[model samples]
Target: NNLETYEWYNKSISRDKAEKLLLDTGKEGAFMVRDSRTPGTYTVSVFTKAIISENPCIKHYHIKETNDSPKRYYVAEKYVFDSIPLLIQYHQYNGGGLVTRLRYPVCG
Candidate 1:
């Protein structure tokens, strides 16, 4: 998949920037994907509204790439996908192991 084409993809934003953006959205499940600290890796930053604590928070998930012949992408170990887009699509409906399902996209 062409990562650049997705509205949820942020080419090279810093983790701090992503945290701010997601937190600014201030809603549970607001999310975006950005370049990880390591080259060729990506991170999913998702916001979860506070249910008990007064402060809301963001969770950063490292998008893992498998070492297989063609490679695969995943967050939780139990679920894997052939492409990052598909990985995100699956998590959108079911967080699986994320802080919450990806319900909103934050482009900037």
Candidate 2:
């Protein structure tokens, strides 16, 4: 297995599972990606992953490499919320900001 060759970059055009992350996304509190086919021109795609913090708090607990290259994973940890029940929401659009409302017990 060439698992040893896989390195974590802040950003890259990665197809290998969790191979890369845009540094700015982490700064924006999510793991995101920006791709490019030419120098100085990149398409910053929309971030469409579930998260619960003011950072890329979704840590990789484990990763297993199958015959198909880097694939399969276990994630862990969370932050910035007091276990808000039933918080299954994707609160971003068009690569903009996070939109969330405090429920009754949250800040009411």
Candidate 3:
């Protein structure tokens, strides 16, 4: 999937570390993708500004894979993409089912 090519991909960070990075940004929609507990899985961690009970929060969405010849990736099942980069690009313009549109990549 060429995940390493993207700046948003943080291959070795743990959940706690991902949360810390997003929290440190303090920016709405600041986000990054980190390694998931399960092998070959990834979690997109996002920072939201006061969207929940007037308190800032971090949201995690696991990237899902389709079992097909040309596998697809999606956070919102209906909004699938052929590649992770394309998925991120789409969310950058529209939140779709995310808490907020992915704005700033944490750049890990």
Compose the digit string of candidate 3's lDDT tens values, residues 32-104.
7865643244667776766556446677666666654445666877566665666776776776666775776
Candidates ranked by lDDT, best first? 1, 3, 2
lDDT of 2 at 67: 25
Q: Model 1, 3-108: lDDT tens per residue?
A: 6655566667667787777777787776678766432456677767764665466777656777544346777775566655666777777666667756665556
lDDT of 2 by residue, 4-98 (tens): 22122123444332313422333333332222332222222223233455332322211211222222111122211111111111112222133
TM-score of each: 0.78, 0.20, 0.77
- lDDT computed for candidate 2: 0.23
| Arranged by TM-score, best first | 1, 3, 2
Clashing pairs in 1: none
Candidate with the larger lDDT of 2 and 3? 3
Model 1 TM-score relative to the real fold: 0.78
